C-alpha cells in the first residue's frame, strides 16, 4: 500500500493472467549460450536472411555442449541424502573446456514423485587459464559453500 | 564412517546410484540418467534444413538404455537436460519472429510463427501429425506435464508462467492475433480507396479468431 | 595409430570407406617392403 | 458474402462487388474447414500469390514475361570470394575516371 | 496574390514524401553490417591458447640438453583473449547507437 | 497393356495429358481403381512435366 | 610465410637440433583474422 | 587450399551431357595447415558433411 490505485489492482491481474507475464525478458540463468544468438541478431535495420545466419551460428556451438562428458563428483564429505553434490565436465573433442553444475535433491514431492523439474542447475564454465594437468585429474571441492 | 557405490558405470555413462529404497527422501530406484546421443540423431537433419527440425515427426526421434535396463523410444525431456530440447525447439523460432513483427516484416514473422501453430493447414503428410497434435508443431507445447507442486511454497507468476502448456500455447495465439491487424493498419494509412479498403481481407480474418 | 615397425617411412595417408560412418578409420599404402598391418 | 447494413455513403465499381465476393470466398474456404471441403498442400502453399493482391498479382507474370526487369548486378552472388575484390576498390562515396 | 502564396505552403510540403518515405538506402545498411561483422569475436582470438599450450606441453628440443617449455606462455595468452571482447562490445554500441 | 488406359483415360476421362495442368496429386490419386493405381504412381514425374512441354513452341518464334 | 619459415625446418643442427616454434602458425592466424575488423570499421566511415 | 563439386544427374538425355549449371565453384579452407606428408591433405565425405 506503498503506492495505490492500479498498483494494487496488478497485485493479482499480473498473476491471474499468465500472458500479460510471459515476455521473452526472462530471468535467464543461460547466460553462457543465450547471448550467442541475440549478438548476430544485434543490428538497427535487417532482413530475412540475417536470421539463418544467426541460427547456424548457435545451432554449431549447441551440439558440443550436448556431448559433454561428466569427469568426477563431489559428494558432501561423508554425508548422504539432501546433498547439493558438485559435478565437473569437460568437451571430448578437445581437453580445452571445463565446467560444473549441481542439483537439489530436497526438491520433490512425496506422493511416488521424485526430484522435481526445476531441481537441476546449468553448466558454469571455468576461467584459470590451466595446461598441465595430472592426465586429465582436475579436482573440485566444497569449502564451507566456497 | 561409511561407503556408499555412488561410482563409475558401464557403457552409457549414467554412473551407479548405491540404493534402491534410495539415498534420499523416497524409493526411486538405483537407476538414473545423464548423457544423451541426441546430436548423432540431429546433425544429419540439421544439415538437410531447418525446416526437417522444426517438424514433429523429427523431435519423434529414438535413443537407447538397455545398458540400464530399460528402453528409450524417443528423445525424453528429462530435467538434467530438458532445457536444450526447449531452447532449440521453441526460443530459438521465436526470437527471429519477434524481431519481425516489429520490423515490418510481418509475414516473415508469420513464416516462423508457423513453426509453431498451423490454423491454415490440415493435410500434411504423416497420418500421426493428422492424427495427434493436431494444430502445434513443437511437441512440447502438448508433450507430458505435471502438478508443478515442488515450487508452490514460494508461488509467484514467475513459477506459474511455466505450469502448464495451455496457457503458454494461448499466449502464441494471442502474439499471432496481433500480427495480422499490425499488417492490416499499414494497408490502410497512406495508401488510396481500393488499397486501404483491402484491409478489410484483414479485419475479417482477425475476427475469425 | 600406424600398428607396424618403422615409422618416418613413407606410406601415403588413404581410406576407401564402404560401411558404418563411425569406423571410418584410415589406412597406409606401405610398411617396410610388402606386408600388411593389422589396423 | 455481402457487406448488409452498412456504408450509405461510398462509391465503387461493381467489379469490385463480384471481385470482393469470390476473394472473400477463396480467403474462408482456407480460414476454416466448414463446409467439409479440404486443400492440398500444393493449394495449401500458393494462396502466397493472393495474401496481398493489386499490382503484385499481375507481377508474377510480367517479372518473367518481361527479362530486362529482373536483369540487375544485385544478382544471388556465390562468386563471394573474388566479386567483393572488385567492389571494395570502388567502395568511395565520390570518384572519378582514374 | 493569395493563389501565389499558395506555393510558398504547398512546396514546402509536397516534397516531404521524398522523406517520411525512402527514410534508408543500400549504403548507409552496409556501414551498419560492417560494424555488426564483429559478432566473430567469440572466435577472433581462439588460436592463441592452443598454440601457447602447444608452446608449453611438450619440450622443443631434445638431446644432452632437453627442454624449451615456454612457462608463461598460456596466462601471457589469456590478457590477450579477455582484451578483446572491449573493442567489439564497444563497437557493437556504435552500431546499435 | 498401355492402350487399355488410353481407350478410357482419352475415352471419358480426360480429353488429353496437356487438361492434366488442372490437378493436384491427391485430387489425381483418389480417382483411380487398382488397375491404374497399380501402375500409375510415376506418372505425374512426366506427366506434369509434359503440363509444361508445349510452353515456348510458340514463343521461341520471337525472330 | 614467415611463420610456416619458423616451422618447416629447424633453427638450430648439431649435438642438439631442433628449435621449430610449434604454435607459430595458428598463433599467427588469429592476428590475420583481427585485421579485417579495422578495415571493414572505417570503409563503413569511408561509406559514412 | 580449395575444394569444389559436380551434379553429374543434371543432363539432358537427347545425347546432351552436364548442363552448364552442373559444376560449382571453388571455396577456400581456413585451418592453419604448416606441416603435411608431402602435399598429401586428404577430403572425405561424413554423411554430407
Not at chain 1, 556431448?67 to 573433442?93: P, S, W
Not at chain 2, 544423451?36 to 514433429?56: M, N, P, Q
Not at chain 5, 501565389?4 to 514546402?12: G, I, L, P, Y
Not at chain 5, 608449453?56 to 590477450?80: C, F, M
Request: proline share 4%; net charge negative.
Amino acid at each position: 500500500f506503498a503506492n495505490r490505485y492500479g498498483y494494487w489492482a496488478a497485485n493479482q491481474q499480473l498473476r491471474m493472467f499468465p500472458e500479460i507475464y510471459v515476455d521473452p525478458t526472462l530471468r535467464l540463468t543461460k547466460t553462457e549460450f543465450f547471448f550467442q544468438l541475440e549478438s548476430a541478431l544485434n543490428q538497427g535495420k535487417l532482413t530475412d536472411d540475417v536470421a539463418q545466419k544467426a541460427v547456424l551460428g548457435y545451432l554449431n556451438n549447441f551440439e558440443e555442449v550436448s556431448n559433454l562428458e561428466i569427469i568426477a563428483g563431489y559428494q558432501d564429505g561423508i554425508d548422504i541424502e539432501n546433498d547439493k553434490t558438485y559435478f565437473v565436465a569437460r568437451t571430448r573433442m578437445q581437453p580445452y573446456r571445463y565446467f560444473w553444475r549441481s542439483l537439489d535433491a530436497s526438491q520433490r514431492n512425496a506422493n511416488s514423485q521424485e526430484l522435481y523439474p526445476t531441481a537441476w542447475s546449468e553448466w558454469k564454465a571455468i576461467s584459470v587459464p590451466l595446461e598441465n594437468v595430472a592426465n586429465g585429474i582436475v579436482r573440485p571441492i566444497m569449502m564451507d559453500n566456497r | 564412517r561409511d561407503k556408499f557405490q555412488i561410482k563409475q558405470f558401464s557403457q552409457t555413462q549414467y554412473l551407479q546410484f548405491p540404493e534402491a529404497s534410495s539415498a534420499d527422501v523416497w524409493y526411486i530406484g538405483k537407476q538414473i540418467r545423464l548423457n544423451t546421443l541426441f546430436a548423432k540423431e540431429l546433425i544429419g537433419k540439421a544439415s538437410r534444413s531447418l525446416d526437417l527440425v522444426l517438424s514433429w515427426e523429427t523431435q519423434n526421434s529414438r535413443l537407447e538404455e538397455a545398458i540400464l535396463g530399460g528402453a528409450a523410444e524417443l528423445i525424453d525431456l528429462d530435467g538434467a537436460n530438458g532445457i536444450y530440447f526447449w531452447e532449440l525447439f521453441f526460443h530459438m523460432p521465436f526470437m527471429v519472429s519477434w524481431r519481425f513483427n516489429v520490423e515490418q516484416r510481418y509475414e516473415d514473422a508469420n513464416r516462423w510463427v508457423k513453426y509453431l501453430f498451423n490454423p491454415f493447414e490440415c493435410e500434411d503428410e504423416p497420418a500421426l501429425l493428422l492424427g495427434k497434435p493436431p494444430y502445434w508443431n513443437s511437441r512440447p507445447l502438448v508433450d507430458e506435464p505435471f502438478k508443478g507442486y515442488s515450487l508452490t511454497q514460494p508461488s509467484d507468476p514467475d513459477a506459474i508462467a511455466a505450469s502448464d502448456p495451455i496457457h503458454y500455447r494461448k499466449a502464441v495465439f494471442n502474439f499471432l492475433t496481433k500480427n495480422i491487424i499490425d499488417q492490416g493498419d499499414m494497408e490502410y494509412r497512406k495508401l488510396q480507396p481500393s488499397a486501404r479498403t483491402l484491409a478489410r481481407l484483414s479485419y475479417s480474418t482477425a475476427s475469425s479468431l | 595409430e600406424v600398428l607396424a615397425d618403422q615409422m618416418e617411412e613413407m606410406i601415403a595417408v588413404v581410406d576407401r570407406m564402404e560401411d558404418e560412418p563411425r569406423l571410418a578409420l584410415v589406412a597406409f599404402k606401405e610398411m617396410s617392403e610388402s606386408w600388411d598391418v593389422v589396423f | 458474402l455481402l457487406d448488409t447494413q452498412v456504408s450509405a455513403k461510398v462509391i465503387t465499381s461493381r467489379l469490385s462487388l463480384v471481385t470482393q465476393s469470390v476473394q472473400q470466398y477463396i480467403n474462408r474456404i482456407a480460414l476454416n474447414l466448414e463446409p467439409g471441403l479440404s486443400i492440398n498442400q500444393q493449394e495449401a502453399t500458393d494462396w502466397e500469390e493472393f495474401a496481398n493482391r493489386y499490382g503484385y498479382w499481375a507481377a508474377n507474370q510480367q517479372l518473367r514475361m518481361f527479362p530486362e526487369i529482373y536483369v540487375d548486378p544485385t544478382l544471388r552472388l556465390t562468386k563471394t570470394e573474388f566479386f567483393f575484390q572488385l567492389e571494395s576498390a570502388l567502395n568511395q562515396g565520390k570518384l572519378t575516371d582514374d | 496574390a493569395l493563389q501565389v502564396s499558395k506555393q510558398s505552403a504547398q512546396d514546402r510540403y509536397d516534397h516531404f514524401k521524398e522523406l517520411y518515405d525512402e527514410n534508408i538506402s543500400s549504403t548507409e545498411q552496409k556501414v551498419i553490417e560492417l560494424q555488426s561483422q564483429a559478432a566473430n569475436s567469440l572466435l577472433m582470438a581462439q588460436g592463441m591458447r592452443t598454440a601457447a599450450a602447444a608452446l608449453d606441453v611438450i619440450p622443443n628440443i631434445y638431446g644432452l640438453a632437453v627442454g624449451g617449455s615456454h612457462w608463461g606462455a598460456p596466462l601471457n595468452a589469456a590478457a590477450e583473449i579477455i582484451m578483446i571482447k572491449y573493442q567489439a562490445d564497444s563497437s557493437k554500441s556504435e552500431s546499435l547507437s | 497393356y498401355s492402350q487399355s488406359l488410353a481407350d478410357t483415360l482419352l475415352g471419358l476421362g480426360y480429353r488429353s495429358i496437356f487438361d492434366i495442368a488442372k490437378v493436384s496429386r491427391q485430387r489425381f490419386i483418389k480417382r483411380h481403381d487398382e488397375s491404374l493405381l497399380g501402375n500409375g504412381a510415376v506418372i505425374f514425374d512426366k506427366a506434369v512435366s509434359m503440363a509444361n512441354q508445349v510452353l515456348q513452341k510458340y514463343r521461341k518464334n520471337r525472330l
